[PDB]
Ligand binder design. Structure first.
Ligand SMILES: Cc1nc(COc2ccc(C[C@H](NC(=O)O[C@H]3CO[C@H]4OCC[C@H]43)[C@H](O)CN(CC(C)C)S(=O)(=O)c3ccc4c(c3)OCO4)cc2)cs1
Lengths: 99, 99
């Protein structure tokens, strides 16, 4: 499918057996979600963006389904004004930019 | 043309008669550039992202060339760790997400 950008490219994802909404974000290296609790061990991490940096939890090898794909990747959990699906996952689902 | 996401989708832009590099960012509503000086009047604006908000200058009706397309749009000038091309401009150059 094709997604035009006149609106935010929001998609539904499934992680931890629950559904959430997230933004397909080509400007994001990593995936950051704020409204979920993930199980197990994690690594502290710091990411930076417009406005400054913030501390988040890095969960590795997290199973997640986006669009119609079931992939595994790193998911950062922490403060963010919007759930973001980064390139680390967009590449695995075959999402590309075209013009 | 197609752009796969295994690397940051950086493109060359021309604005104010000068060449710069910026990130095609589907997760950005607006376009924010840090390494340029734009002529004329502007309106103060505040945008928020991961890490918090920041004050920037809003320049309207700015001619900008990207991916061989010559368009006009709003460009924000202020602190940002990366130059970002937002949806306000990606839509005008016909950039879409496909998977
Ligand atoms: C209400 C409110 N709503 C809001 C809006 O909330 C949003 C909505 C979207 C985003 C994502 C972010 N966008 C962004 O800063 O855009 C700004 C310019 O236009 C405006 O429209 C949206 C927020 C704002 C980039 O797409 C990715 N970023 C990297 C760019 C800046 C190069 S990052 O910092 O988020 C990131 C992600 C993942 C990463 C990473 C860095 O490093 C490693 O992994 C952030 C906050 C604020 S308050």
């Amino acid at each position: 499918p094709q997604i035009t950008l006149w609106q935010r490219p929001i998609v539904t994802i499934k992680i931890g057996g629950q559904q959430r909404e997230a933004l397909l974000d080509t400007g994001a290296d990593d995936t950051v979600l704020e409204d979920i609790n993930l199980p197990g061990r994690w690594k502290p991490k710091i990411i930076g963006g417009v406005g400054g940096f913030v501390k988040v939890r890095q969960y590795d090898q997290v199973p997640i389904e986006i669009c119609g794909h079931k992939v595994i990747g790193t998911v950062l959990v922490g403060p963010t004004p919007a759930n973001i699906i980064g390139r680390n996952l967009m590449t695995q689902i075959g999402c590309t930019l075209n013009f």
